[PDB]
Design a protein around this motif. Structure first.
Motif, PDB file in Angstrom:
ATOM      1  N   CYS A 120       0.887  -1.153   0.000  1.00 34.58           N
ATOM      2  CA  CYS A 120       0.000   0.000   0.000  1.00 34.58           C
ATOM      3  C   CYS A 120       0.922   1.198   0.000  1.00 34.58           C
ATOM      4  N   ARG A 121       0.843   2.002  -1.057  1.00 32.04           N
ATOM      5  CA  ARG A 121       1.673   3.192  -1.172  1.00 32.04           C
ATOM      6  C   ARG A 121       0.829   4.459  -1.284  1.00 32.04           C
ATOM      7  N   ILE A 122       0.846   5.278  -0.241  1.00 34.64           N
ATOM      8  CA  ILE A 122       0.102   6.518  -0.269  1.00 34.64           C
ATOM      9  C   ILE A 122       1.064   7.582  -0.762  1.00 34.64           C
ATOM     10  N   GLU A 123       0.755   8.109  -1.934  1.00 33.14           N
ATOM     11  CA  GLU A 123       1.599   9.085  -2.580  1.00 33.14           C
ATOM     12  C   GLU A 123       1.465  10.509  -2.082  1.00 33.14           C
ATOM     13  N   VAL A 124       2.546  10.970  -1.470  1.00 35.14           N
ATOM     14  CA  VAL A 124       2.668  12.318  -0.940  1.00 35.14           C
ATOM     15  C   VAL A 124       3.661  12.946  -1.914  1.00 35.14           C
ATOM     16  N   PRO A 125       3.388  14.170  -2.394  1.00 25.66           N
ATOM     17  CA  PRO A 125       4.290  14.835  -3.344  1.00 25.66           C
ATOM     18  C   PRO A 125       5.626  15.285  -2.762  1.00 25.66           C
ATOM     19  N   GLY A 126       6.576  15.485  -3.664  1.00 24.78           N
ATOM     20  CA  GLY A 126       7.911  15.885  -3.288  1.00 24.78           C
ATOM     21  C   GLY A 126       8.718  14.625  -3.482  1.00 24.78           C
ATOM     22  N   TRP A 127       9.889  14.555  -2.872  1.00 22.64           N
ATOM     23  CA  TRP A 127      10.696  13.362  -3.002  1.00 22.64           C
ATOM     24  C   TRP A 127      11.046  12.829  -1.626  1.00 22.64           C
ATOM     25  N   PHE A 128      10.883  11.521  -1.468  1.00 23.95           N
ATOM     26  CA  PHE A 128      11.181  10.824  -0.227  1.00 23.95           C
ATOM     27  C   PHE A 128      10.107  10.858   0.875  1.00 23.95           C
ATOM     28  N   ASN A 129       8.944  11.457   0.636  1.00 22.81           N
ATOM     29  CA  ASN A 129       7.965  11.498   1.701  1.00 22.81           C
ATOM     30  C   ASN A 129       6.845  10.470   1.725  1.00 22.81           C
ATOM     31  N   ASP A 130       6.694   9.697   0.652  1.00 16.46           N
ATOM     32  CA  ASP A 130       5.617   8.701   0.582  1.00 16.46           C
ATOM     33  C   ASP A 130       5.472   7.707   1.748  1.00 16.46           C
ATOM     34  N   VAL A 131       4.273   7.163   1.969  1.00 15.91           N
ATOM     35  CA  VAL A 131       4.089   6.182   3.057  1.00 15.91           C
ATOM     36  C   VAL A 131       3.845   4.795   2.483  1.00 15.91           C
ATOM     37  N   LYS A 132       4.878   3.959   2.505  1.00 13.99           N
ATOM     38  CA  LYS A 132       4.785   2.609   1.959  1.00 13.99           C
ATOM     39  C   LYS A 132       4.531   1.622   3.077  1.00 13.99           C
ATOM     40  N   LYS A 133       3.595   0.706   2.863  1.00 15.21           N
ATOM     41  CA  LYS A 133       3.269  -0.289   3.870  1.00 15.21           C
ATOM     42  C   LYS A 133       3.103  -1.665   3.252  1.00 15.21           C
ATOM     43  N   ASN A 134       3.924  -2.619   3.677  1.00 11.77           N
ATOM     44  CA  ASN A 134       3.832  -3.975   3.151  1.00 11.77           C
ATOM     45  C   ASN A 134       2.843  -4.767   3.999  1.00 11.77           C
ATOM     46  N   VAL A 135       1.955  -5.506   3.341  1.00 13.58           N
ATOM     47  CA  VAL A 135       0.956  -6.306   4.041  1.00 13.58           C
ATOM     48  C   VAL A 135       0.928  -7.746   3.547  1.00 13.58           C
ATOM     49  N   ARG A 136       1.107  -8.680   4.474  1.00 18.05           N
ATOM     50  CA  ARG A 136       1.099 -10.099   4.157  1.00 18.05           C
ATOM     51  C   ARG A 136      -0.328 -10.647   4.136  1.00 18.05           C
ATOM     52  N   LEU A 137      -0.571 -11.670   3.326  1.00 18.05           N
ATOM     53  CA  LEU A 137      -1.906 -12.245   3.268  1.00 18.05           C
ATOM     54  C   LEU A 137      -1.922 -13.764   3.216  1.00 18.05           C
ATOM     55  N   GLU A 138      -2.330 -14.376   4.321  1.00 21.99           N
ATOM     56  CA  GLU A 138      -2.433 -15.819   4.389  1.00 21.99           C
ATOM     57  C   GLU A 138      -3.868 -16.169   4.041  1.00 21.99           C
ATOM     58  N   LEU A 139      -4.047 -17.235   3.276  1.00 23.08           N
ATOM     59  CA  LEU A 139      -5.374 -17.667   2.890  1.00 23.08           C
ATOM     60  C   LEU A 139      -5.495 -19.132   3.268  1.00 23.08           C
ATOM     61  N   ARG A 140      -6.463 -19.450   4.123  1.00 23.83           N
ATOM     62  CA  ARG A 140      -6.685 -20.823   4.575  1.00 23.83           C
ATOM     63  C   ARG A 140      -8.009 -21.411   4.096  1.00 23.83           C
ATOM     64  N   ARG A 141      -8.185 -22.694   4.416  1.00 23.01           N
ATOM     65  CA  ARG A 141      -9.369 -23.480   4.095  1.00 23.01           C
ATOM     66  C   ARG A 141     -10.095 -23.791   5.398  1.00 23.01           C
ATOM     67  N   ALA A 142     -11.337 -24.241   5.272  1.00 21.69           N
ATOM     68  CA  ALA A 142     -12.145 -24.556   6.442  1.00 21.69           C
ATOM     69  C   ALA A 142     -12.536 -26.023   6.455  1.00 21.69           C
ATOM     70  N   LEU A 143     -13.679 -26.338   7.048  1.00 21.05           N
ATOM     71  CA  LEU A 143     -14.129 -27.724   7.140  1.00 21.05           C
ATOM     72  C   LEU A 143     -14.644 -28.170   5.775  1.00 21.05           C
ATOM     73  N   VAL A 144     -13.775 -28.266   4.783  1.00 18.90           N
ATOM     74  CA  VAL A 144     -14.279 -28.578   3.457  1.00 18.90           C
ATOM     75  C   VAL A 144     -13.875 -29.940   2.897  1.00 18.90           C
TER      76      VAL A 144
END
Length: 114
Positions: free
Chosen positions: A90-114
């Motif tokens: 997730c990268r929220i773009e703030v103008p100028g150089w070097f100010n952006d807010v980058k956030k890495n997010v992991r995503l695990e996907l599981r199964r159920a009683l199937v």
């Protein structure tokens, strides 16, 4: 810090968290991509806003349910399959150089009683 991880099911929706109550239509934009955040913009871009709304998308699998003008830009993936696991950026773009807010997010996907 710790980044954050999302546990979800398969063939079910999922929402990667990401805000910025510091948002401004007149100055902010934002993008989601697959993989860790690059040095500039998003890789494997899946969603893009323009300060007030979505302007581009990889397909109708990705969507923003919150309000883009209020910094609620949490990704919502529609049908999820084992292929969607991994780190997203997730990268929220703030103008100028070097100010952006980058956030890495992991995503695990599981199964159920199937």
């Amino acid at each position: 810090m710790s980044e954050d991880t999302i546990i979800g099911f398969l063939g079910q929706p999922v929402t990667l968290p990401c805000h910025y109550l510091s948002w401004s239509q007149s100055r902010n934009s934002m993008c989601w991509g697959k993989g860790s955040c690059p040095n500039s913009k998003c890789n494997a871009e899946l969603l893009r806003t323009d300060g007030t709304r979505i302007i581009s998308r990889k397909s109708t699998k990705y969507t923003l349910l919150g309000k883009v003008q209020f910094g609620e830009v949490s990704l919502t993936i529609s049908n999820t399959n084992r292929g969607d696991s991994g780190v997203y950026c997730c990268r929220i773009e703030v103008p100028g150089w070097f100010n952006d807010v980058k956030k890495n997010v992991r995503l695990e996907l599981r199964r159920a009683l199937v």
